[PDB]
Amino acid sequence: MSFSPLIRQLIESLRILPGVGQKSAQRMALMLLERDRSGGLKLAQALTAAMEGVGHCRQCRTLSEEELCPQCADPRRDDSLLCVVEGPLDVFAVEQTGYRGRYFVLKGHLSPLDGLGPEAIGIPELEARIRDGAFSEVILATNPTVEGEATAHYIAQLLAGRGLTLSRIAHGVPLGGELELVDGGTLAHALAGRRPI
Amino acid sequence: FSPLIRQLIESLRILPGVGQKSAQRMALMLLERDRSGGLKLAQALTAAMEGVGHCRQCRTLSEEELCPQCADPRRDDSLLCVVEGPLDVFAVEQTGYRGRYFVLKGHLSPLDGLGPEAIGIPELEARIRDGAFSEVILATNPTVEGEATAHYIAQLLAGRGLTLSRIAHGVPLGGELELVDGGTLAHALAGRRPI
């Protein structure tokens, strides 16, 4: 209200960004105007181009300008591995590990209390992806939450007896810690999930 | 990332406090869940970058030739509050202040070539000439450079029959002396006032 309408609007529109509260949006708006008008315009152009041009890959459903994303388009990748994740940011997180297989991107996880079931998250499309490929292993890389685990289990039962190996990413202690500093539940899980050798 | 995603990420890093990691997450979240919000932001950015100028009186950022504060006639025309930027106008407005403002472009910094003309001193002098102020409140930030700017303005305005005041600063309110940094405490002690 102390700001003129166009400044007020820029502030409110900046709050649309993830992790940007009101105070931070105020500072961003005013900094753009004070010192980087051309940078503001470049961001506007980049936003318009991406919001209009970026769709979804027809295979894995990740974000892509092309009909096949960079990962599905690349022939160097390992066609025997499919990694199932809950969203495009998870595709990016797994990519940073050096994984070179294929992906399928669910829309989040099963959540009965939000009315989000198999159809809503993309299970039928996952089934089609598997039918249309030649995978030997499907890696369940849903988030390690109650809901993420329930989604993994639903997919594992759905796909049983089709000659695929189904795996789940390891749960346990993160690297670098001391046991005394790890979250108790994580430690209990790492113990209960201990493996021989 | 595809070229369009890469461009969006690089352009988002232009924002204050947004590193590469944070820009990556912003880009992808915006695309996954709020494409139309991204377009609205683009439109708001373009409109503001092209349409926002300066208030002709206080020199704050405004698309209107008089900003909300200068455009209200019901304010106190005897008080002028001098600040370093538009966010400081906003901060002082929240206190219920009802006078007028002048907005400098930052503070003096001669080694960056920001002297009196660059920060708006001539425009401050014109504001004073064109008004009928009885008090000028120096509300630059209590930083080394903000204080130097306040002092420059105080010497400029001396002997004009104006009351020249400075916002209180030193130990912060709510502070315990045991927790304040020593430099602040030494300053507050040396700058102690009557009670």
Ligand code: NA
């Ligand atoms: Na486990």
Ligand SMILES: [Zn+2]
């Ligand atoms: Zn793909």
Ligand SMILES: [Zn+2]
């Ligand atoms: Zn104004």
